[PDB]
């Protein structure tokens, strides 16, 4: 009964780990000798956006590299303007605790989600001026951690009750539900083609999903502690995870192995947020050692320090055009960088 | 480029309207005190929050005491894991920690003591004070009369404990129950003092979950926390 199933599971695990060991031929560092270092990237704050009361726990860029939304745990949701540091909307929330936001790709909708277990959708059409909550999406029993828009009419949400949904804003009902994790899902990033989305969970495991069928395709177990942040490579065929074990790691969706890991001796603290750039050469990585950081996807070596904050950095989003690099700390302050 | 000056002025009008909308909520956010209510489920936690009153993840609770506003964020339908959604509770004024002194299927004081140990040493909670409520103190009166009770075996260090002289128990009870009661407070104070950080302090209290003085105790300890926090940046403490 239970013993036979456990033996079958452990034999399958042995086979899987042996197959993964078979895929390994050489380390990524060896074949990257010709890759020159990017050098010391002296980055300086171009603009700084005062206006948030309490810590910013998440923020998103618009699809035109101009407007950015920034969630705060003070009960606000500010829609900035990176060009002129102007506030074009300051829409409040009915739940004080906000753990994630999202800016719709069309630039017409916004989302939010936190401990209230409801993923409010804000409509910026404004046929009457004042924004409205177009739909509240309920059905989760844990707590929302990251919601991103597939398109104008499909929003995927991650919850802490080991469940990823995929809603439908037209009708407000789960099209499909993704189960199979063990702990707390807390970060997912959609693909550049918006076909699949990864999902890291606090059990130190990532699981590529799919939005058509609804079944996990590949899984990854490389981290030794709860995962914190995750994204995609600009090509969409790789993704870097960062977990609270003071390590960063990189994956591939077809190699199924830790292609190249990043670490150093002096780091003894975890990582809070992660993002790439569009050339796939600058892994920007917001650490909890009171400063952001940058690494190289092909060098695994230091390239710059974005030290301007006074607490952790919980959000770090490079812009779509690649022109600027926002950042936001628990110091309730938001900065914009542009290397010059 | 004369078609942009009007739009720039309109955007400035929107920006100044928004800053006006935010500077008024400045004071609203800085006025209230955020209190995180926490503890084991099998305690009188729900009774405490119901007294404070007189599906969602977080149950709000607003109340005024001496014309200061308290937001009490009782945790609602959530999972047992606390490692993650506690990290966002670091701006709270204090963490009310309601623990039941039920020394019985499984021991509650050791699990709650371990949970307080995890709360105390957390990296982001090194600056948030904790307010201890030792509930069900009256139950110890009826629990110590069983003879070979659960108070002397699961904690053999109580077998040779001498009650402090400076501690004056509630009059009307035998010294034995006072000993068995102050023992738990000593168990908690051992860790609450052994950390030595000095940036955050505990506050032990005894309550029976049915009285008006719970809210008064919360308000007094919050005022004390605020006073010590103000003294902190003056290097007076």
């Amino acid at each position: 009964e239970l013993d036979q199933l456990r033996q079958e599971a452990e034999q399958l695990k042995n086979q899987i780990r042996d197959a993964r060991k078979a895929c390994a031929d050489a380390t990524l560092s060896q074949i990257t000798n010709n890759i020159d270092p990017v050098g010391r990237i002296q980055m300086r704050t171009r603009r700084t956006l005062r206006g948030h009361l309490a810590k910013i726990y998440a923020m998103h860029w618009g699809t035109d590299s101009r407007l950015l939304v920034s969630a705060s745990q003070d009960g606000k949701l500010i829609i900035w303007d990176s060009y002129t540091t102007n506030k074009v909307h300051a829409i409040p929330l009915r739940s004080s605790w906000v753990m994630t936001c999202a800016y719709a790709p069309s630039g017409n909708y916004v989302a939010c989600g936190g401990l209230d277990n409801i993923c409010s959708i804000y409509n910026l059409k404004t046929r009457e001026g004042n924004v409205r909550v177009s739909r509240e999406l309920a059905g989760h029993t844990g707590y929302l951690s990251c919601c991103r828009f597939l398109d104008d009419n499909q929003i995927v949400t991650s919850s802490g009750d080991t469940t990823c949904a995929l809603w439908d804003i037209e009708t407000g009902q789960q099209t499909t539900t993704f189960t199979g994790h063990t702990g707390d899902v807390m970060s997912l990033s959609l693909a550049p083609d918006t076909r699949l989305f990864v999902s890291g969970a606090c059990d130190a495991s990532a699981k590529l999903w799919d939005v058509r069928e609804g079944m996990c395709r590949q899984t990854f177990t490389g981290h030794e502690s709860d995962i914190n942040a995750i994204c995609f490579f600009p090509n969409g065929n790789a993704f870097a995870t960062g977990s609270d074990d003071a390590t960063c790691r990189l994956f591939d969706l077809r190699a199924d192995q830790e292609l190249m890991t990043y670490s150093h001796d002096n780091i003894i603290c975890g990582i809070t947020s992660v993002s790439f750039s569009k050339s796939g050469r600058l892994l920007l990585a917001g650490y909890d050692d009171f400063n952001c950081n940058v690494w190289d996807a092909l060098k695994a070596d230091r390239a710059g320090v974005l030290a301007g904050h006074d607490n952790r950095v919980s959000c770090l989003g490079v812009t779509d055009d690649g022109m600027a690099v926002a950042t936001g700390s628990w110091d309730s302050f938001l900065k914009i960088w542009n290397g010059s | 480029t004369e078609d942009q000056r009007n739009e720039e002025k309109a955007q400035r009008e929107a920006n100044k309207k928004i800053e006006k909308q935010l500077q008024k909520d400045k004071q609203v956010y800085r006025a209230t005190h955020r209190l995180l209510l926490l503890g084991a489920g099998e305690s009188g936690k729900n009774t405490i929050v119901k007294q404070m009153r007189i599906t969602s993840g977080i149950f709000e609770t607003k109340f005024q005491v001496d014309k200061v506003n308290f937001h009490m964020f009782d945790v609602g339908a959530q999972r047992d894991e606390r490692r993650k959604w506690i990290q966002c509770f670091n701006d709270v004024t204090a963490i009310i920690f309601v623990v039941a002194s039920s020394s019985n299927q499984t021991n509650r004081l050791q699990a709650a003591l371990k949970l307080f140990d995890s709360i105390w040493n957390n990296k982001w909670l090194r600056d948030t004070s904790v307010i201890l409520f030792l509930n069900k103190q009256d139950l110890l009166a009826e629990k110590v009369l069983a003879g070979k009770s659960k108070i002397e075996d699961y904690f053999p260090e109580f077998a040779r404990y001498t009650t402090p002289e400076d501690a004056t128990p509630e009059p009307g009870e035998d010294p034995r129950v006072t000993r068995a009661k102050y023992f738990i407070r000593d168990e908690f104070l051992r860790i609450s003092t052994a950390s030595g950080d000095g940036r955050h302090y505990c506050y032990p209290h005894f309550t029976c979950s049915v009285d008006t003085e719970n809210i008064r105790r919360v308000f007094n300890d919050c005022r004390d926390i605020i006073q010590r926090m103000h003294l902190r940046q003056y290097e007076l403490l």
């Epitope: 059990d203 502690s225 003071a246 | 999972r79 894991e81 606390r82 490692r83 506690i86 371990k114 990296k123």
Partner: nanobody
Framework: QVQLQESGGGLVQPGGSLRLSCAAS????????MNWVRQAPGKGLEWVSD????????SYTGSVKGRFTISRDNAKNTLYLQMNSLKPEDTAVYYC?????????????????????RGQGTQVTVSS
């Protein structure tokens, strides 16, 4: 993948002797504190005894102190819990629990059904 394995056990008379050994792989053993969590039949998960990175601080549940002792040895990459001087009221499944947070003495989840970094444990039965 983080894994834990446990051994030991077997029928022992009350007041006898026993030892429980914990094997870990997939992570560095020095960083994390390690403790023992035993579940008695039909009961919730109970906590027994913990050892920190080196072994400077060792603590016990009162019902277990005076008879059991713990040991940690980073070089052997294993954890020890000596289990002599038995009582007929502690027959249980043992889980060599790991705390997830490295380089710190504060971590929450240890005693829960939904925790991930715990082993299948070993059954320890004590009877006449």
């Amino acid at each position: 993948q983080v894994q834990l394995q446990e051994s030991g056990g077997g029928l022992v008379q009350p007041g006898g002797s026993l030892r429980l050994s914990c094997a870990a792989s997939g992570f560095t053993f020095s960083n994390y504190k390690m403790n023992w969590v035993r579940q008695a039949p039909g009961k919730g998960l109970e906590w027994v005894s913990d050892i920190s990175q080196s072994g400077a601080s060792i603590s016990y549940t009162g019902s277990v102190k005076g008879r059991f002792t713990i040991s940690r040895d980073n070089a052997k990459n294993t954890l020890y819990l000596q289990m002599n001087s038995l009582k007929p009221e502690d027959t249980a499944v043992y889980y060599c629990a790991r705390c997830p947070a490295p380089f710190t003495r504060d971590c929450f989840d240890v005693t829960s059904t939904t925790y991930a970094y715990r082993g299948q444990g070993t059954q320890v039965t004590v009877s006449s």
